[PDB]
Amino acid sequence: GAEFLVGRSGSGKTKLIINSIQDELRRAPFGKPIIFLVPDQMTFLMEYELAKTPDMGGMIRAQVFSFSRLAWRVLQHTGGMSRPFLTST
Amino acid sequence: VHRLYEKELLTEEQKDAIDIEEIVQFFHTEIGGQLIGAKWKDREIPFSLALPAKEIYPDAHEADEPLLVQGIIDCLYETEDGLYLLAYKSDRIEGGFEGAAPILKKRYETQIQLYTKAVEQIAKTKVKGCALYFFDGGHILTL
Amino acid sequence: FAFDEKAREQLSWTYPHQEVTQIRTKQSVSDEYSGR
Amino acid sequence: LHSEDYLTLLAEHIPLAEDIKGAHIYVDGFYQFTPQEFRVLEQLMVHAEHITFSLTADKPSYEREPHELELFRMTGKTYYRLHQKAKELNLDITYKELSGTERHTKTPELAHLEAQYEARPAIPYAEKQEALTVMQAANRRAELEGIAREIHALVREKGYRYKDVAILARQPEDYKDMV
């Protein structure tokens, strides 16, 4: 199932998202994984907001991923992480 | 261990360094069997917990803004009794374990509390009992 | 002078939340935005 | 392994990662995607139970790609592509359009800039100046130094906090040292 949330800048897309994940955290704290996929520079911003609730003040079911951390996660399970990494240099 | 090697979750060196006896030893313990038998289980559980700034930094008492403590709970499992926390530690012990326990207890003391807090506050459930397994001699202490 | 009062306040002014401005937001217990 | 090898590795490892099945996924903050990142998203669309795509645009179309000169070229083009993939993948699709302003409800002028940014047949703002101001400085030194005073006026007078202010530059390399 795919959902397309579209709107101009400052229409509240992100706010709607954060809140939805929070209620999902409220209703089923140990439920199936919730993956919040944002750009690399948006991760720590989302981690701070998500956790910002009177009710919970944090999260376990939901996680904030950049494509890299998401990849790193899945790979620490499915495999490939012990393969030596090469720097651009 | 070999499959982890095949799938490259382990380096050749890491593979040859594993003491299997110390890995199987856990599943023969009271805790191990309890882990095996459980309605529900999960491992490598990431979490983000928001705490008042001073609750960590006693030094700065003035402001109550929340800061994020983030970690990974090694293991959690639920039984008909309650939810239990599980962490494995490669800590150096035998070199009795009776005398190390008091020291180990408070080396990981603050850490485990953060965990229980993370779970209890976020999940709004409660953690009854915490266990730490030690590869050196296969030791277990409860918190 | 006209501004005698404002000036003295602004020079004695501090930042109410200043104690926190140096504290790291994310702190890991074991990502470049956190600390230990 | 290559810095840019993880994404291809991820895309092909997603199918056999069973904890991402029944997982709810939200993507946000992206204007566009690379083919490689794309490979990941469509692999997520397959194995994830729910995925929501948040894109900043204005009633984009999935039949036609945005013309060269329209504002939401990037985001519109990504919407059309993400939608055509969800169509060929036979996914249950749902839409949500956000119409009203949320960020600028109490700031008419900023609300004006956002809405009238595009249309060249643009209507002038007919009200008072308060929230929006352009300013000229003798040089980058005075520019930052002037802005520094403004920030203090904001925190000391108008009751803002430092965390509420954000300063941007197209070429941070020009102000970085002086900042």
Swiss-Prot record, chain C:
Function: An essential component of the DNA double-stranded break repair machinery, the heterodimer acts both as a highly processive, ATP-dependent DNA helicase and an ATP-dependent, dual-direction single-stranded exonuclease. Recognizes the B.subtilis Chi site (5'-AGCGG-3') which transforms the enzyme from a helicase which degrades both DNA strands to one with only 5' -> 3' exonuclease activity. This generates a double-stranded DNA with a protruding 3'-terminated single-stranded tail suitable for the initiation of homologous recombination (Chi fragment).
Designated name of the protein: ATP-dependent helicase/nuclease subunit A
Membership in a protein family: Belongs to the helicase family. AddA subfamily.
Organism encoding this protein: Bacillus subtilis (strain 168)
Subunit note: Heterodimer of AddA and AddB.
Signal peptide extent: none
Extra remark: This enzyme is a functional homolog of the E.coli RecBCD enzyme; unlike the RecBCD enzyme it degrades both duplex strands symmetrically.
Curated annotation (Swiss-Prot), chain D:
Leader sequence segment: none
Effect of F30A: No longer recognizes the Chi sequence nor generates the Chi fragment
Annotated ATP binding sites: T56, R103
Purpose: The heterodimer acts both as a highly processive, ATP-dependent DNA helicase and as an ATP-dependent single-stranded exonuclease, acting in both directions. Recognizes the B.subtilis Chi site (5'-AGCGG-3') which transforms the enzyme from a helicase which degrades both DNA strands to one with only 5' to 3' exonuclease activity. This generates a double-stranded DNA with a protruding 3'-terminated single-stranded tail suitable for the initiation of homologous recombination (Chi fragment).
Oligomeric form and interacting partners: Heterodimer of AddA and AddB.
Family in the record: Belongs to the helicase family. AddB/RexB type 1 subfamily.
Additional remarks: This enzyme is a functional homolog of the RecBCD enzyme; unlike the RecBCD enzyme it degrades both duplex strands symmetrically. Despite having conserved helicase domains, this subunit does not have helicase activity. The conserved residues of the helicase ATP-binding domain line a 3'-DNA channel in the enzyme and are responsible for Chi site recognition.
Protein name: ATP-dependent helicase/deoxyribonuclease subunit B
Natural source organism: Bacillus subtilis (strain 168)
Gene that produces this protein: addB
Residue span relative to the full protein: 181 to 359 of 1166
